[PDB]
Design an enzyme around this catalytic site. Structure first.
Site, mmCIF file in Angstrom:
data_model
loop_
_atom_site.group_PDB
_atom_site.id
_atom_site.type_symbol
_atom_site.label_atom_id
_atom_site.label_comp_id
_atom_site.label_asym_id
_atom_site.label_seq_id
_atom_site.Cartn_x
_atom_site.Cartn_y
_atom_site.Cartn_z
ATOM 1 C CB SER A 49 -1.058 0.038 1.105
ATOM 2 O OG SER A 49 -1.935 -1.070 0.973
ATOM 3 C CE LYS A 52 -4.460 1.788 -0.814
ATOM 4 N NZ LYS A 52 -3.700 0.555 -0.665
ATOM 5 C CB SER A 298 -4.650 1.137 3.406
ATOM 6 O OG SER A 298 -3.569 0.836 2.521
#
Ligand code: ZA3
Ligand code: MG
Ligand code: MG
Length: 466
Positions: A49, A52, A298
């Site tokens: 993640s 992102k 997330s």
């Protein structure tokens, strides 16, 4: 003092839990550009993640902090004296936070605007993005779970966290020996039910499994729930988010006194429609505000949708191919060297993604002096903060340490990948760090990342709150 810090970090990475792992660790003072610490900074690693960070920066570059997303209901012409329309179209342009309440508030509008009957069929139009629902290399076995939800321009987001394209399933024990009650949530009357679960004796073992078998729209519930067990709730994805959004809209319509006589299905506003009648609309909150639940928790749906939305802005193509190029372009525009970056999705779910720790820190630097800097850091988890919308995935890490309340960073975890990158502000300078671990075999090396984060907090002149 610089060397002490270096020796400490060296030792922290001496940890046994990093056996056979490659670890990218880079720390940079951001006032001066000084490279305080660097190890395998140029090594290409999967980011989970942390991807992102890239996505979120591009979206702010491309859509802007003030961007919002709309959804409309459309008929071919306004309704009659008799208040009638033929077919009706719910049209989503990629709002990642469309609630069931918004569908309700839009059904009330459709009623207030004088429709009493949809004579034809109701269509859910998610054609603003393409219909490629999952990324190539995402794992089929993961498709039941919220973070792996299908991607659509028309998706219903559940709860204050705005988990898109899922439904809440809740399983309540009954009397021992009778089947468990399964409640399918929003997807009642949309997703199919295969309930094989049973209520076990009071105090027996909990073996309840809720699944959605690959390539079906069936919730298959198996196992045994203890007669005395707390009800179990689980977020499970559904096939074709837009069709569920359609399903929910028919119910909001009937609820607001509007009878739908036709079918519910997918469909785009026909081309041969001269001047469509917009009978209702909703506007999302602005991107700056949406970044909070997206980044704090997330959200993978939000990430991909942002990508496809970028594809739309840069090219009128709500597409991964289009959006990813969009992200890479935006990042270059920012000053980021995207050499080491391989972009395969917005969320990081994909194992086709690659970053380097230098690139991450690079991005952290650029994002710091961008005009949207503040709304950007505001979105990041703050270490050890117990209010979920503040602490996010860092809520229960580093409490009672110099890092508590200070360190802002994004997390990243799947098998053999863990990452932590962000900022340490202070009485010294604002520090940007990136820690990416690949190839460890046990649990994610969270203690190892914490140690580094905490020592950087201490190096920037912080102390554990007591
Ligand atoms: B990110 O959240 O660090 C990448 N991780 C995930 O997408 C994720 C999140 C939550 C559960 C599972 C999962 N998986 O990648 O399997
Ligand atoms: Mg229903
Ligand atoms: Mg402090």
């Amino acid at each position: 003092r610089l060397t002490e810090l270096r020796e400490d970090i060296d030792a922290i990475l001496e940890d046994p839990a990093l056996e056979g792992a490659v670890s990218g660790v880079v720390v940079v003072d951001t006032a001066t550009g000084e490279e305080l610490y660097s190890r395998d900074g140029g090594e290409q690693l999967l980011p989970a993640s942390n991807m992102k960070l890239f996505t979120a920066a591009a979206a702010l570059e491309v859509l802007g902090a003030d961007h919002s997303f709309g959804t409309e209901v459309a008929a071919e012409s306004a309704p009659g004296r008799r208040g009638e329309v033929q077919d009706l179209y719910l049209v989503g342009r990629g709002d990642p936070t469309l609630s069931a309440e918004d569908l309700d508030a839009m059904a009330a509008e459709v009623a207030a605007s004088g429709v009493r009957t949809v004579r034809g069929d109701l269509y859910a139009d998610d054609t603003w993005f393409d219909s490629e629902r999952l990324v190539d290399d995402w794992w089929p076995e993961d498709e039941p779970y919220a973070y792996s939800a299908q991607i659509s321009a028309l998706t219903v987001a559940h709860g204050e966290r705005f988990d898109t394209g899922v439904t809440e399933v809740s399983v309540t024990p009954a009397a021992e020996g009778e089947p468990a009650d399964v409640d399918l949530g929003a997807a009642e009357g949309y997703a199919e039910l295969d309930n094989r679960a049973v209520t076990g004796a009071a105090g027996s073992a909990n073996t309840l499994v809720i699944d959605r078998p690959v390539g079906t729209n069936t919730i298959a519930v198996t196992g045994s729930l203890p007669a005395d067990a707390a009800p179990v709730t689980a977020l499970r994805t559904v096939d074709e988010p837009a069709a569920l959004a359609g399903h929910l809209f028919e119910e909001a319509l009937e609820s607001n006194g509007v009878t739908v006589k036709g079918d519910v299905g997918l469909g785009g506003v026909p081309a041969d429609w001269q001047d469509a009648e917009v009978l209702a609309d909703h506007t999302s909150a602005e991107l700056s505000e949406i970044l909070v639940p997206f980044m704090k928790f997330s959200n993978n749906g939000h990430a991909e949708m942002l990508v496809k939305s970028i594809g739309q802005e840069t090219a009128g193509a709500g597409t991964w191919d289009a959006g990813l190029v969009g992200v890479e372009e935006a990042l270059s525009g920012l000053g980021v060297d995207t050499a080491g970056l391989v972009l395969n999705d917005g969320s990081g779910l994909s194992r086709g993604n690659l970053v380097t720790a230098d690139t991450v820190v690079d991005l952290l630097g650029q994002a710091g002096s961008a005009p949207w800097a503040q709304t950007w850091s505001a979105s990041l988890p703050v270490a050890g903060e117990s209010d979920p919308f503040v602490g996010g995935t860092l809520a229960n890490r580093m409490r009672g340490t110099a890092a508590e309340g200070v360190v802002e960073a994004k997390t990243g975890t799947m098998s053999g990948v863990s990452a932590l990158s962000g900022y340490v502000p202070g009485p010294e300078g604002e520090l940007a760090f990136s820690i990416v671990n690949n190839g460890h075999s046990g649990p994610a090396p969270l203690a190892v990342q914490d140690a580094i984060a905490v020592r950087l907090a201490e190096y920037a002149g912080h102390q554990a709150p007591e």
